[PDB]
Design a protein around this ligand. Structure first.
Ligand SMILES: [Zn+2]
Ligand SMILES: [Zn+2]
Length: 85
């Protein structure tokens, strides 16, 4: 009895464009290869898959990006076993 979730998951909150009058953001999401404060989580992922993609290994058929070399092939073997193109 008392099976309950604490689901306060509300990730986002940020719409706008322009300059900045103050540093803003915080150490919430960091691109693991360069210490740089991202508020948005997609901002962390994009700084990897574009620039800092040497350290991270993306299983090419899906956007599931690994942070290790064995994990790369382990998707294609286990969780993506139709994809040998
Ligand atoms: Zn980076
Ligand atoms: Zn995959």
């Amino acid at each position: 009895m008392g099976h309950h979730h604490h689901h306060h998951s509300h990730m986002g909150d940020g719409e706008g464009a322009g300059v900045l009058g103050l540093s803003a953001s915080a150490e919430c999401h960091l691109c693991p290869v360069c210490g740089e404060s991202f508020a948005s989580k997609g901002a962390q992922e994009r700084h990897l898959r574009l620039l800092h993609a040497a350290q991270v290994f993306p299983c090419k058929y899906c956007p599931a990006t690994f942070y290790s070399s064995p994990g790369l092939t382990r998707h294609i073997n286990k969780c993506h076993p139709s994809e040998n193109r």
